[PDB]
């Protein structure tokens, strides 16, 4: 009823059923938008109404993109994406370009609509069911399912890749100096051209897609005060790596030396070349914290030496595309946040500092979700995969507001941790 192209069979992980996740409350503003965008997809036949007979479910909500003003439907298919991780990852996965990280500017286009044009495995459809709630539980939730590749499902880009690689053949041939990567509902396009000349080429790419049926959100560019649309492109080169740094002083109290060894002990797990014996000697008997201990000559020989190792590449740390990705965020105060991305205990791949934003305007929750997105983006670009998050916040709290500030087509996998200030292993 949509496309005569043959349907590709998708089966969930052996011994695992479909998603049966409940639907969280939604604000009237989102229900109103969600009911509208759903009605239209029903008419066009992308979506079909279903009832209780379908034991499966997934959560939905909508985000009003400040990108294009226009709402976007989001379906939290994280559960479903795990249940079918054999199909898209190992089976038929999208290669990653090591060169995207290496581009002065990279823009990202929302190529979701592209999916509403390939029929979804008739059998697999039952799993994509979702429910729309109603204010004050006025009417039973209205349920639907997909008949075509759904947006936000790891399988869609995998299946649509065949036609996607054909839609890009021309553009990539007339611009072999532009890198293009597809990650779910996104197209990361990066170039070394001048900014204004990049804006053009992207705008040209939108055309080439439009000449193929693929439409991409019309991003607004306001002419007033905060010219936010200048941030649309990412700059992978401008991305820095926040290293570990030991304080500098002349008068070191007992207290100071303790903390300086604590941190150095922590860091000994990352860099095996950190010694603390020579420095801890200064602390021998039960001394009073407030006591300026003179730093020995051969003692301050390690303090200024260890720091000469805290600015080097970690010990043969390489990325393995076969292992998951983890990321930790620690609230460093005054609006600053630090993060680390690794696959193994202490051998991390990137350590950075997500500096503040005036649009956050002192709101811890808003800044953390922005940090999560920002970090995810970097991940997808650099390695091509979303990291799992160890979020410094309480479940109850994050699940009450994260949606109000979410602005991405994808949703990362996260868990909550209540780890107190382990140590200022990351001196900001």
């Amino acid at each position, epitope marked *: 009823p949509i496309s005569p192209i043959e349907t590709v069979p998708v089966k969930l992980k052996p011994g695992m059923d479909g998603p049966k996740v409940k639907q969280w409350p939604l604000t009237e503003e989102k229900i109103k938008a969600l009911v509208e965008i759903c009605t239209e997809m029903e008419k066009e036949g992308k979506i079909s109404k279903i009832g209780p007979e379908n034991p499966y479910n997934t959560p939905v909500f909508a985000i009003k993109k400040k990108d294009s003003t226009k709402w976007r439907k989001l379906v939290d298919f994280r559960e479903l994406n795990k249940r079918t991780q054999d199909f898209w990852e190992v089976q038929l996965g999208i290669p990653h370009p090591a060169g995207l990280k290496k581009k002065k500017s990279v823009t990202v286009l929302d190529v979701g609509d592209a999916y509403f044009s390939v029929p979804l495995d008739e059998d697999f459809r039952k799993y994509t069911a979702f429910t729309i709630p109603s204010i004050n539980n006025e009417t039973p939730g209205i349920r639907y399912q997909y008949n075509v590749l759904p947006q936000g499902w790891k399988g869609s880009p995998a299946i649509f890749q065949s036609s996607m690689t054909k839609i890009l053949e021309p553009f990539k041939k007339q611009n072999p100096d532009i890198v293009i990567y597809q990650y779910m509902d996104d197209l990361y396009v990066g170039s070394d051209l001048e*900014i*204004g*000349q990049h*804006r*053009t080429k992207i705008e040209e790419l939108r055309q080439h897609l439009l000449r193929w049926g693929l439409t991409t959100p019309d991003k607004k*560019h306001q*002419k*007033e*005060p*905060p*010219f*936010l649309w*200048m*941030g649309y492109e990412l700059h992978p080169d401008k991305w820095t790596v926040q290293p570990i740094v030991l304080p500098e002083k002349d008068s070191w109290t007992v207290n100071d030396i303790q903390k300086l060894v604590g941190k150095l002990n922590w860091a000994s797990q990352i860099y095996p070349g950190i010694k603390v014996r020579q420095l801890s000697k200064l602390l021998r008997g039960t001394k009073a914290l407030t006591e300026v201990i003179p730093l020995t000559e051969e003692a301050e020989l390690e303090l200024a030496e260890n720091r000469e190792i805290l600015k080097e590449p970690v010990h043969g740390v390489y990325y393995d595309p076969s292992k998951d990705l983890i990321a930790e965020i620690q609230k460093q105060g005054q609006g600053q946040w630090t993060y680390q991305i690794y696959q193994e205990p202490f051998k991390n791949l990137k350590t950075g500092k997500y500096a503040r934003m005036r649009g956050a305007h002192t709101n811890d929750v808003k800044q953390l979700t922005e940090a999560v997105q920002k970090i995810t983006t970097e991940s997808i670009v650099i390695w091509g995969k979303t990291p799992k998050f160890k979020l410094p916040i309480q479940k109850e709290t994050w699940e009450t507001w994260w949606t109000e500030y979410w602005q991405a087509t994808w949703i990362p996998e996260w868990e909550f941790v209540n780890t107190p200030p382990l140590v200022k292993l990351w001196y900001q």
Partner: antibody
Amino acid sequence: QITLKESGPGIVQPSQPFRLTCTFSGFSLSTSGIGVTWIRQPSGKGLEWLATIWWDDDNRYNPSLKSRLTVSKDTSNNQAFLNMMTVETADTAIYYCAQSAITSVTDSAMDHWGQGTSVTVSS
Amino acid sequence: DIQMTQTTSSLSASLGDRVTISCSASQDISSYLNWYQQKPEGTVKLLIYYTSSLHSGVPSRFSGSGSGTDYSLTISNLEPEDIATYYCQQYSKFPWTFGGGTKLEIKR
């Protein structure tokens, strides 16, 4: 290397319309941040903002004269236009056209200007 | 409609002096003000943009400051050219508005 020259009729009958031309070089009215602004300056008074036409055609007009203003552009030959309808003696002034441009998230100023064309209104 | 006013209308001074021009906004403009210089002939040049950023080519003896509603231009040591009329323009909201202009003279 950015140059801008206004073209005009200099002398315009009352109630009739006039068309100013800003011929420029050095930039394109197609690049992301550019736009062309029209400024007026009555003889003796200070600067008055008329309108700014941008690359994406998202133009902005002075609320007091939006009813008599119309800003066009010929992106091909690098020309910006300003039409004013039913002019009065009060529109006798020097009209400048400058290259407005949005550099970053906060930088937005009229980087270069023209020398202006004098348009006087009288029978 | 943001009213930009430069109280000081005509200001006289001497070569080498330090002068400061004040630009008062009708409402908070969040540091979205630009400064313009208009020589006696008429040509108009952009000195400062975004409260205090010098436009390439303008001498270092030019500096802007201000915040919220009050903004000021400061020419460290007057030179012969400097003696001119100065304009402040706000762009935190269309319509764009200009100050009233401050003519800088030569004390005699």
